[PDB]
Symmetry: C5
Subunit: 45 residues, 5 copies
């Protein structure tokens, strides 16, 4: 058999998954940042 076609599909799937991770990570950084700023302006601190 020729496994090249399947290997290419696996690599493409890896990039698809990586794009999802990157998207999630950038949103996560935004949430943590909001949380940080909120704690900084917390009068009780």
């Amino acid at each position: 058999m020729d496994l090249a076609p399947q290997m290419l599909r696996e690599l493409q799937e890896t990039n698809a998954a990586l794009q999802d991770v990157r998207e999630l990570l950038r949103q996560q950084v935004k949430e943590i940042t909001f949380l940080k700023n909120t704690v900084m302006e917390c009068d009780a601190c």
Copy 2:
């Protein structure tokens, strides 16, 4: 020995692990977002 069969298996394992990482990241962003909001409504702040 042709190594394509083994390489394909490695690629498949990579994607399976990525699937898990993506799922964990999704659940994590949810917890953080919940924490963010919980703090924005903290009495002593």
Copy 3:
């Protein structure tokens, strides 16, 4: 020389590191969740 063997080795090392990442992230979510619950019970909030 044939680089196929070395390519397979790189893929195997990648999966090892990715496995460690999966485990670390799994523990991290638990820590964040515990953190979330602790804040939800913070009397000052």
Copy 4:
């Protein structure tokens, strides 16, 4: 080179995506560390 060219392009895209993830994680750690300090140094605690 049959599918070789396409496979190399996928690998290049993966490395680029990884670089971004790495940069995002670097920023996230500083935010979390800045938060860890802000708390460790909160009066009411």
Copy 5:
């Protein structure tokens, strides 16, 4: 043979970045765990 030299190079760069990510995550969970303990002991809570 094949674009093997080029593909191997991309795989080596990917591993280098992944090892860095692993180390970043390791340090990050440490900081989060520290944050968790600090809150658990926050008398204001």
